[PDB]
């Protein structure tokens, strides 16, 4: 458990306001956000996702699609997946992580991400 | 990204795992980041990302066996998605690798991303 951590917790799939941390950020600073699990965003087998996005379907390349785990700063939202390393900070305010899906669809939803946050030097 | 010291990709047909050349000794610090979609077998069931199998139908969604993983001194060590300020706990050169059973890696398909960083 590096000593520089300086948030751990989780994000549930189906809560469209996403996580507050409560880590208040100013802008320049540096931090690692780090993230894992599955996550459904809909009721079939195919709906599953990782931190890096939705699975590859039925005849499609087994290639990243649109991150499913994302940080909201300053109401701007910012891709993060499996991990963003040594993120300058672009603005002031209190970090959210949140799973990204439709409005109004996030209540077929399931699962949660277990995301670490790190400052670093 | 200015520590990077190796990228590359992890195939998962290759049971060897990649010589990333990085060599490495005891104490030094590493992170290890990767993403991406394998595939394990010909089925749809058989998808993996580097944090391992996708839950079948009827499965939990917890985290199963690391795909992605590391050898170093003769020990294999779970990655994943990332393992963070890894202190190295023996020296010798950095393998990344494609965890499946043994002569069970011709049916797979795909690769990880990976990068290393020296902290
Ligand atoms: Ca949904
Ligand atoms: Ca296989």
Same mark, same amino acid.
């Given at each position: ?18 996580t507050?941390?409560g880590? #208040?950020?100013? #802008?320049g &600073?540096?931090?690692?956000i ?5 996550a459904?965003?809909?009721?079939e087998?195919?709906?599953l996702?990782?931190? *890096? ?5 039925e005849?499609e390349?087994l ?6 785990? *994302? ?7 910012? +891709?993060?997946?499996?991990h ?5 900070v +672009? #603005? &002031?305010?209190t970090?959210?992580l949140?799973? #990204?899906?439709g409005?109004? *669809?996030?209540?077929?939803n399931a699962?949660?991400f277990?995301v ?5 030097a």
């Amino acid at each position: 458990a590096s000593e520089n951590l300086i948030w751990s917790g989780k994000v549930d799939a189906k809560n469209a306001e996403g996580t507050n941390t409560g880590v #208040a950020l100013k #802008a320049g &600073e540096i931090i690692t956000i780090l993230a894992s699990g599955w996550a459904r965003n809909g009721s079939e087998n195919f709906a599953l996702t990782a931190p *890096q996005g939705r699975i590859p379907r039925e005849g499609e390349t087994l290639t990243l699609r649109n991150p499913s785990l *994302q940080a909201r700063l300053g109401n701007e939202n910012y +891709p993060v997946g499996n991990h963003k390393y040594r993120w300058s900070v +672009p #603005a &002031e305010g209190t970090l959210t992580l949140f799973f #990204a899906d439709g409005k109004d *669809q996030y209540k077929d939803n399931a699962g949660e991400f277990s995301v670490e946050v790190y400052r670093e030097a």
